[PDB]
Design a protein around this ligand. Structure first.
Ligand code: DGD
Ligand code: DGD
Ligand code: DGD
Ligand code: CLA
Ligand code: CLA
Ligand code: PL9
Ligand code: LMG
Ligand code: SQD
Ligand code: LHG
Ligand code: HEC
Ligand code: BCR
Ligand code: OEY
Ligand code: CL
Ligand code: CL
Ligand code: FE2
Lengths: 32, 52, 137, 176, 36, 114, 97, 244, 30, 153, 334
């Protein structure tokens, strides 16, 4: 299907960035 | 299901009158059965015995 | 706009004579048309043969002509095909076939006349809606 | 009047396809869900605080104590559904959050529609469908419905436009 | 196809029997308070 | 491309009804100066009265790149009539940007939305 | 090189008259006395090479030949168009009201 | 024997043609002065083969098997026509009417579905000359028309059609139309197929015959959108001949 | 690529279900 | 349409399926169109046209009587479709015909009642169980069952 | 004890992380089958002739759908209400063409969710609870039965069941409005009151309890830490919340019995969703919504349109376009 090529990067970063935010905060909560 | 229709498919009065002969007899015999019996132990254990 | 004798004046026969209906007769034919005809003919179409409607223009080009009371009354007694060639009382309700179309059994000559006036009056009121079908709903 | 508005939004804006409305649907149906499941859970973990069969009299608004068991409710839902609430404050904050956020999201979508900034189409589906007469999905089927709504309702719904549509131009399937 | 049919009839039968027999195995007594 | 003028077989000039912005798609209807429907592109053809073939609809261009040209074959007249709903007709380059043919909004719309 | 043959037909006499070789049978309602009886004969009896061959249909009555003559002015013939005559479409073309 | 609808309904036998014993190897005399009719012709297909579209190397095209996916819906039956005796003695069947088409979808390896209008419309099939009787060596060969698989009112998924529908890709308002013309412009094909009928069983008493058939025709071209495939169909047929 | 992306996200959510249920913070009666 | 001269057996509809007649999935001949879903129907006005393979084209061509045409038209115009204020017909029909099939009234009323009696079953069954075991009025604060159970995790 | 009693004790164990129970013995295998078949079909299933007219609709991701357009397509109209298990097909390919997965999924699913409801009753009995949670769930369960089972039954075909997709859901909603004027049906109006009002009271209750949380924390921590799981005390002041809400309206429009308040929360959405499930289930038998088309006429008899007549124009465009190749005769009677 002739989809948008920046769709992949937009979806990937949309997941990746906020998720890494939360992971960073959860792990440093656990180690204190 | 479609094309079969369980008992909704009955399509002649002979079968209708017929099954009401069976049901009448079945119900009369069942009535006598229950008048003369008390429930069996497996059935006592299975049910709740109360008005509600 | 209101229901005026001008509106209620419709061709009696083909030769040009007319007749003027009362509001009472109009209302009465509307009821009777609902009672006996609307199941197939609601708004001037024919559900079981959409190619034939009850528009005055259509009725006029029927053989014999049917855009007048006498013609319609006779159609309700002895219905025929659009070209007059066949009688169709056997599959179209009529006085001829009141045995098989029981709703016709009670109908009197003054009843058929009211129904015919309703049919002939209604396209003056509704215009295109009468006989046009769902496009004009 | 409001129903006509709904159908207008379907035929002209394809609003069911809009993710801001979808969030709003989830928030409202989700709110209704939470309303029902919280009310039922509480009514079915009550403690016996009176001797009557009507359990309503056994509550006194001045009492200190929880009227139902959070501990038994939590276990029930853990074993039924896999998770449960364990914090009554989070529980009731979440009940505020869900439907409030849903409505807020749908507002944003309508602000979009003010500008006809719709999620009307999916370009990739239109490029394929245009080229491939055998490609059908529920997306293309619903656009045909939208096309039906617009041409059949427009002349009477926007009378100031004096739309005149001969019968021959009206989109129609076979027979109907 | 026939083999599939039989295998599903048997599976379904097996599970339905467990359901019936389980509930017949004195289910009212299986609660935390009154063992009847 | 030029201003497109449509005429029927009787030489009367016809005007394509313009697409309102509400409509993703819109039928091609030509009316006279009074707004009486005079030509269209029908959906169902079996009972059409106003088809371009039936009405002898032509298009002639004035100004622009097509100035002084007249097209009479119904397929060509029909494509220019489908563009006349968008207003004035322009030649476009779709190749360079690999354009897909679907209208976008302008910075005025995007500013306003945000 | 690609044309919608139904649109091309609208530019012929099919577009203005009843085309004895193509038009659907419901169009014979437009004129008095044609429907249903004669419309059926007309459609049934092959295509016609000329409009007036219609008077040669076996079995017409004198009254019928006279109705056909009265309506020759409303008839045309064009070449048979497969897309219009296949699928029994001359009897029912999917169009109702 | 006498079967009722109620005996057959739901079994798949409604899609089967009648058969004749293995001892029905008689001969039906053809009385040249007489006039005859096929009172019932039944064609029941048993295999659908589709010719492979090979590669640019002009190697070889084979007819590969296919999987039927539209179920017991394939048979032509109640077909009737005049059976003519000709001058040279040959017999000619001219179909008048019947249930003479079934749309069929088969599937090729790889998942390509091939629809086709399996049909004998306007069949004209003739025997060899001087046929004084129909025997278990009698062959008819003929040809039929294959109209378009969809007819003129069929709308495609974007609303486009021949006798109705949009005449363009309305979802791409300002696309170059020339790339889409083959899809936008619906075309109605009419093509010919060829069929052999090999009589292998004759009940000279009743006028029943039975045998096999092979036909070749084209598959659906989706109103000109793509090229059709060649299909070969094989099966069995039954017919009863009555003096007319 | 877009099929793979839809399925990857769906898969990740099913994984989160597993951890959220079986590796939840255990609620304890304080 | 047959009356106008159509060969209803060989009339290919738009989809390629027969316009009037097609085959069911087991081959029986049946009416075409959306009604293909209703080919299991059996009724006195229609069975005379049935043969061993389903509808019979010779009976259709020759043996349809006026009473069958009458019945068919009567029944078509009295399909069980109608509005709550008893406007007969599909939802888009204009007012005129004051009709709702008693089959509709009887079916709808008894589904509603049946459904509400399943709910009452669940209500009173659940309650009778809880009552018999003695916790229909709530959990006993001094012997709460869950509290004596092991943590799940 | 003997092996049967060991198994029975495990099945009904209140110590399993997830309760199994006898309903669970049927629920688990049917939900698993339905779930696996759904996931595989939504990704890979080939096109399905939903309307029985050899016009296959592509529903799966690999055949050019996305999450929003994809669906498991309902089974063919040619099949109507006939049972179509895999073993009635000549091949899986036939089964896929004709929409077999839709039957397998909805039947296993309806069966599993019915057992889900019964499972809710069962665990409540083992835990000593009051039993009626399962009744609340019966509102959404009934709703599922209406679009997957009851509506197909009344219309005579599973091809008019709800599709298992996002866009297919909307398709089902639109065609429904056209053929039943569902918006003008009071049971649907009750359903909208049910879910709107349920959302309202959801936000209301959350906001009101949140507003009257007792100070138990500081400003650098979540107030949520003011509640400890299991604690006997309450964490908000219902008297304060009654005093706020009583004044916002008037005193007797406001609840001060927590039990009454929470029963109201259960009952409102559940009842409304019962009515809208009953609304689908009775439009299944073509008792449609109110019809005021041309109900207002003037002294001459001209039609004076109302908004109902405007709705009808929209309904007509849905009517004339849906399944554009599937009707050969002028009424769409099912
Ligand atoms: C404890 C119990 C647990 C149950 C476990 C077992 C589950 C099996 C039940 C599944 C049945 C559901 C599918 C039924 C579908 C259907 O076609 O059912 C209809 C069939 C009737 O079938 C029709 O029957 C017809 C019979 O008429 C025939 O014969 C007639 C004779 O006059 C006429 O001639 C007619 O024209 C002719 O066709 C035809 O066969 C049709 O093809 C055929 O579809 O009815 C039926 O068998 C009657 C009963 C149907 C049950 C009602 C549905 C239950 C609804 C659940 C309620 C919601 C739950 C609430 C959630 C909380
Ligand atoms: C808070 C949440 C909000 C609540 C959600 C919505 C629920 C309440 C609102 C719905 C009730 C509004 C009623 C207004 C409709 C009206 O006044 O109704 C008028 C209609 C009658 O309409 C007339 O119906 C007529 C029918 O015509 C037909 O028949 C005519 C002869 O009758 C002629 O023959 C005519 O030609 C033919 O077409 C015409 O349409 C007239 O124009 C039209 O006025 O009343 C009827 O149908 C009467 C019988 C149906 C009554 C059903 C009402 C049920 C509503 C209660 C639902 C809650 C139930 C809870 C249960 C516990
Ligand atoms: C909070 C919300 C707000 C509160 C608003 C609450 C408003 C609801 C009030 C409910 C009581 C209804 C009062 C309206 C009277 C009404 O009905 O008025 C209508 C009739 C009286 O009106 C007559 O109604 C008739 C209805 O047609 C009937 O009669 C016709 C002519 O003979 C034809 O036979 C047609 O087929 C047949 O349906 C005609 O239209 C007559 O002209 C007209 O006089 O009353 C009746 O019937 C009497 C009704 C008795 C109850 C019958 C129960 C029916 C069971 C249906 C269950 C279905 C499931 C529910 C689905 C929802
Ligand atoms: C209103 C009707 C009615 C009711 C309420 C009862 C109620 C009772 N009967 Mg009586 N009975 C009746 C009519 C009735 N009977 C009639 C008419 C007959 C004559 C046939 C009998 C013959 C009869 C016998 C012989 C016995 C009972 C027994 C019982 C008790 C246990 C019932 C039980 O376990 O349920 C049903 C529970 C089951 C576990 C049965 C199997 C469950 C599966 C799922 C159903 C399959 C079997 C089913 C009957 C056939 C399938 C039909 C399907 C196609 C729809 C209970 C007090 C028993 C008892 O204790 O007697 C004193 C006993 O042994 N009854
Ligand atoms: C709780 C378990 C359970 C239940 C209730 C169901 C239920 C169902 N399955 Mg599913 N299924 C299951 C587990 C289950 N399945 C599992 C684990 C698998 C994986 C292999 C499947 C795979 C599967 C497939 C592949 C298909 C189904 C289908 C069906 C439907 C029809 C079943 C049928 O015809 O048997 C009818 C029921 C019986 C025969 C049992 C009646 C019970 C009585 C009391 C005893 C009868 C004795 C029996 C006849 C004797 C068996 C032995 C004999 C044949 C030698 C039904 C919705 C079909 C479907 O969805 O069609 C739409 C289908 O095609 N199922
Ligand atoms: C013009 C001039 C001169 C101006 C001067 C003004 C002047 C001073 C005038 C004096 C005032 C005057 C005379 C006014 C006259 C005009 C006047 C009366 C205006 C009418 C305005 C009007 C339309 C009002 C709107 C109507 C309205 C919204 C009220 C009725 C509807 C209503 C009661 C809705 C709520 C229903 C309700 C019971 C909700 C329960 C919801 C619920 C479950 C909440 C959850 C919950 C509840 C609890 O309870 C507690 C406890 C907790 C825990 C909890 O979860
Ligand atoms: C941090 C990392 C980034 C976070 C994750 C990324 C999230 C991205 C989400 C946005 C997706 C962008 C669209 C998809 C990709 C796409 O093709 O874009 C690609 C487009 C650009 O478009 C490209 O343009 C090219 C020529 O320049 C060609 O035309 C290409 O075809 C075209 O794709 O990206 C942008 O236009 C981004 C504009 C961003 C500004 C949007 C203005 C609206 C803001 C208001 C929003 C308010 C909403 C609040 C809601 C509460
Ligand atoms: C004119 C025609 C003929 C007339 C017809 C009349 C029909 C009336 C219908 C039947 C009346 C039903 C009685 C109410 C039931 C009841 O009392 O519950 C018992 C409790 C006890 O009340 C509580 O009462 C308690 C005392 S006690 O428990 O009653 O003993 C007390 O402790 C507590 O404070 C107090 O709140 O009532 C409630 O707590 C108050 C809420 C009442 C809600 C009723 C049902 C929910 C409405 C559903 C909305 C449907 C719409 C769906 C979406 C559109
Ligand atoms: C006509 C439409 C339906 C009418 C009846 C509907 C029942 C009310 C709605 C039930 C959904 C609630 C789901 C469980 C919520 C729940 O658990 O409710 C529990 C709640 C209070 O329960 P109690 O055990 O105190 O009273 C119920 C009986 O035990 C009577 O003593 O039930 C009622 O108030 C019943 C009142 C019916 C009055 C008629
Ligand atoms: C269905 C059972 C019908 C009902 C009830 C009524 N009509 Fe009818 N009408 C019906 C058909 C199928 C036809 C066409 C018959 C044919 O083949 O010619 C008609 C035709 C008419 C006409 C002729 C209209 C024309 O344009 O020539 C008229 C005037 C007419 N019908 C009137 C009419 C009346 C007054 C009815 C109530 C007493 C009535 N019809 C009922 C179908 C049905
Ligand atoms: C009349 C008639 C007829 C006949 C009929 C009959 C003969 C019937 C019978 C019927 C019957 C014969 C039925 C039966 C039924 C049964 C049931 C319905 C059962 C149920 C069961 C249950 C309920 C159980 C439960 C349980 C379990 C499972 C477990 C444990 C617990 C308990 C016990 C709870 C016919 C059709 C021909 C026709 C028409 C008419
Ligand atoms: O609404 Mn319209 O009606 Ca119930 O069928 Mn007849 O058309 Mn079709 O298949 Mn799905 O849909
Ligand atoms: Cl659709
Ligand atoms: Cl149809
Ligand atoms: Fe609460």
């Amino acid at each position: 299907m002739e989809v948008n090529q920046l769709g992949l990067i937009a979806t990937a970063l949309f997941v990746l960035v906020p998720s890494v935010f939360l992971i960073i905060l959860y792990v440093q909560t656990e180690s204190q | 299901f479609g094309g079969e229709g369980w008992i909704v498919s009955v399509n002649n009065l002979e079968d209708v009158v017929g099954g009401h002969i069976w049901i009448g007899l079945i119900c009369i015999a069942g009535g006598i059965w229950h008048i003369l019996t008390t429930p069996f132990g497996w059935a006592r254990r299975a049910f709740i015995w109360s008005g509600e | 706009a209101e229901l005026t004798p001008e509106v209620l004046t419709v061709p009696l026969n083909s030769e040009g004579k007319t007749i003027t209906l009362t509001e009472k007769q109009y209302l009465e034919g509307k009821r009777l048309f609902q009672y006996a005809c609307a199941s197939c003919h609601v708004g001037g179409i024919t559900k079981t043969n959409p190619s034939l409607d009850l528009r005055t223009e259509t009725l006029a080009l029927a053989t014999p002509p049917r855009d007048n009371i006498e013609g319609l009354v006779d159609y309700m007694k002895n219905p025929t095909t659009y070209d007059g060639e066949q009688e169709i009382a056997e599959v179209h309700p009529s006085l001829r076939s009141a045995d098989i179309f029981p709703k016709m059994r009670n109908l009197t000559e003054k009843d058929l006349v009211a129904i015919a006036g309703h049919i002939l009056v209604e396209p003056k009121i509704l215009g295109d809606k009468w006989g046009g079908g769902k496009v004009y709903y | 009047a409001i129903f006509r508005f709904l159908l207008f939004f379907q035929g002209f804006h394809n609003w069911t396809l809009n993710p801001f409305h979808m969030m709003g649907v989830a928030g409202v149906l989700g709110g209704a869900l939470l309303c029902a499941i919280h009310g039922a859970t509480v009514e079915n973990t009550l403690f016996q605080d009176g001797e009557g069969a009507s359990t309503f009299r056994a509550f006194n608004p001045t009492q200190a104590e929880e009227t139902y068991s959070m501990v038994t409710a939590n276990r029930f839902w853990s074993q039924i559904f896999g998770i449960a609430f364990s914090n009554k404050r989070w529980l009731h904050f979440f009940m505020l959050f869900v439907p409030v956020t849903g409505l807020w999201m749908s507002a944003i979508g309508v602000v979009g529609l003010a500008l006809n900034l719709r999620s009307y189409d999916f370009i990739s589906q239109e490029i394929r469908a245009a080229e491939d007469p055998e490609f059908e999905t529920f997306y293309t089927k619903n656009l045909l419905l939208n096309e039906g709504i617009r041409a059949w309702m427009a002349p009477q719904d926007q009378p100031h436009e004096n739309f005149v549509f001969p019968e021959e131009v009206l989109p129609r399937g076979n027979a109907l | 196809m026939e083999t599939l049919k039989i295998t599903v009839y048997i599976v379904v039968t097996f599970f339905v029997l467990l359901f019936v027999f389980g509930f017949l195995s004195g289910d009212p007594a299986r609660n935390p308070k009154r063992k009847d | 491309k030029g201003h497109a003028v449509f005429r029927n077989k009787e030489g009367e000039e016809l005007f394509v009804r313009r697409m309102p912005a509400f409509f993703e798609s819109f039928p091609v209807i030509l009316t006279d100066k009074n707004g009486v429907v005079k030509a269209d592109i029908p959906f169902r053809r079996a009972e059409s009265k106003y088809s371009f073939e039936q009405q002898g609809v032509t298009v002639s261009f004035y100004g622009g790149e097509l100035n002084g040209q007249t097209f009479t074959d119904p397929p060509t007249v029909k494509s220019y009539a489908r563009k006349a709903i968008f207003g004035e007709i322009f030649e476009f380059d779709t190749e360079t940007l690999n354009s897909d043919g679907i209208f976008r909004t302008s910075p005025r719309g995007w500013f306003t939305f945000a | 090189e690609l044309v919608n043959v139904v649109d091309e037909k609208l530019g012929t006499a099919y577009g203005e008259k009843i085309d004895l070789n193509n038009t659907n049978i419901a169009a014979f309602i437009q004129y008095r006395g044609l429907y249903p009886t004669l419309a059926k004969l007309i459609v049934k009896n092959a295509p016609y090479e000329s409009v007036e061959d219609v008077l040669n249909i076996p079995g017409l009555t004198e009254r019928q030949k006279q109705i056909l003559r009265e309506n020759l002015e409303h008839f045309t013939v064009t070449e048979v168009e497969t897309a219009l005559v296949e699928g029994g479409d001359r009897y029912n073309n999917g169009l109702y009201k | 024997q006498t079967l009722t609808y109620d005996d057959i309904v739901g079994t798949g036998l409604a899609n089967k043609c009648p058969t004749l014993d293995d001892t029905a190897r008689g001969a039906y005399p053809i009385d040249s002065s007489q006039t005859y009719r096929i009172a019932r012709l039944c064609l029941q297909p048993t295999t659908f083969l589709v010719k492979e579209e090979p590669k640019n190397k002009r190697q070889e095209a084979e007819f590969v098997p296919t999987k039927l996916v539209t179920r017991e819906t394939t048979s032509l039956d109640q077909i009737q026509g005049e059976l003519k005796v000709n001058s040279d003695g040959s017999l000619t069947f001219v179909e008048e009417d019947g249930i003479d088409f079934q749309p069929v979808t088969v599937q090729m390896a790889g998942g390509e579905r091939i629809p086709l209008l399996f049909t004998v419309k306007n069949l004209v099939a003739s025997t060899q000359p001087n046929v004084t009787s129909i025997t278990t060596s009698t062959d008819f060969k003929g040809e039929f028309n294959v109209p378009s698989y969809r007819t003129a009112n069929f709308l495609d998924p974007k609303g486009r059609g021949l006798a109705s529908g949009y005449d363009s890709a309305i979802a791409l308002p300002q696309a170059k139309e020339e790339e889409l013309a083959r899809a936008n412009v619906k075309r109605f094909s009419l093509t010919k197929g060829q069929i052999s009928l090999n009589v292998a069983k004759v009940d000279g008493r009743t006028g029943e015959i039975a045998g096999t058939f092979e036909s070749e025709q084209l598959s659906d071209d989706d109103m000109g959108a793509h090229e059709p495939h060649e299909v070969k169909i094989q099966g069995v047929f039954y017919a009863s001949i009555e003096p007319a | 690529m877009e099929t793979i992306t839809y399925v990857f996200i769906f898969a990740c959510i099913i994984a989160l279900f597993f951890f959220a249920i079986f590796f939840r913070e255990p609620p304890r009666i304080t | 349409d047959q009356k106008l001269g159509a060969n209803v057996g060989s009339a290919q509809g738009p989809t390629g399926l027969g316009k009037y007649l097609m085959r069911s999935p087991t081959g029986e001949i049946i009416f075409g169109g959306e009604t293909m879903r209703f080919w299991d129907f059996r009724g006195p006005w229609l069975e005379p046209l049935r043969g061993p393979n389903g509808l019979d084209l010779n009976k259709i061509k020759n043996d349809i009587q006026p009473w069958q045409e009458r019945r068919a038209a009567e029944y078509m115009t009295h399909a069980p479709l109608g509005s709550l204020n008893s406007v007969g017909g599909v939802a888009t029909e204009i007012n005129s015909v004051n009709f709702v099939s008693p089959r509709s009234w009887l079916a709808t009323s008894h589904f509603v009642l049946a459904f509400f009696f399943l709910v009452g079953h669940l209500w009173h069954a659940g309650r009778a169980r809880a009552a018999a075991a003695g916790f229909e009025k709530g959990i006993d604060r001094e012997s709460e069952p869950v509290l004596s159970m092991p943590s799940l995790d | 004890a003997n092996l049967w009693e060991r198994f029975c004790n495990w099945v009904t164990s209140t110590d399993n992380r997830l309760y199994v129970g006898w309903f669970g013995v049927i629920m688990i295998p049917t939900l698993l089958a339905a779930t696996i078949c759904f996931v595989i079909a939504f990704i890979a299933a080939p096109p399905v002739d939903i309307d029985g007219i050899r016009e296959p609709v592509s529903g799966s991701l690999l055949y050019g759908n996305n999450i929003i357009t994809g669906a498991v397509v309902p089974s063919s109209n040619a099949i109507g209400l006939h049972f179509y298990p895999i073993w009635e097909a000549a091949s899986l390919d036939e089964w896929l063409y004709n929409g077999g997965p839709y039957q397998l999924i909805i039947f296993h699913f309806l069966l599993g969710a019915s057992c889900y409801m019964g499972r809710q009753w069962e665990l409540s009995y083992r835990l000593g609870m009051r039993p009626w949670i399962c009744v609340a769930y019966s509102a959404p369960l009934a709703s599922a039965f209406a679009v997957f089972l009851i509506y197909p039954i009344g219309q005579g075909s599973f091809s008019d069941g709800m599709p298992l997709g996002i866009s297919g859901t909307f398709n089902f909603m639109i065609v429904f409005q056209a053929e039943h004027n569902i918006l003008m049906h009071p049971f649907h109006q009750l359903g909208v009151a049910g879910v709107f009002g349920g959302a309202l009271f959801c936000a209301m209750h959350g906001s009101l309890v949140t507003s009257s949380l007792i100070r138990e924390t500081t400003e650098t921590e979540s107030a949520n830490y003011g509640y400890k799981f299991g604690q006997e005390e309450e964490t908000y002041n219902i008297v304060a919340a009654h005093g706020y809400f009583g004044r916002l309206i008037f005193q007797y429009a406001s609840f001060n019995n927590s039990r009454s308040l929470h029963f109201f929360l259960a009952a409102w959405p559940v009842v409304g969703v019962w009515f809208t499930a009953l609304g689908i289930s009775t439009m299944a038998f073509n008792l449609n919504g109110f019809n005021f088309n041309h109900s207002v006429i003037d002294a001459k008899g001209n039609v004076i349109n109302t908004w109902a007549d405007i709705i009808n124009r929209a309904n007509l465009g849905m009517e004339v376009m849906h399944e554009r190749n599937a009707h050969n005769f002028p009424l769409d009677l099912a």
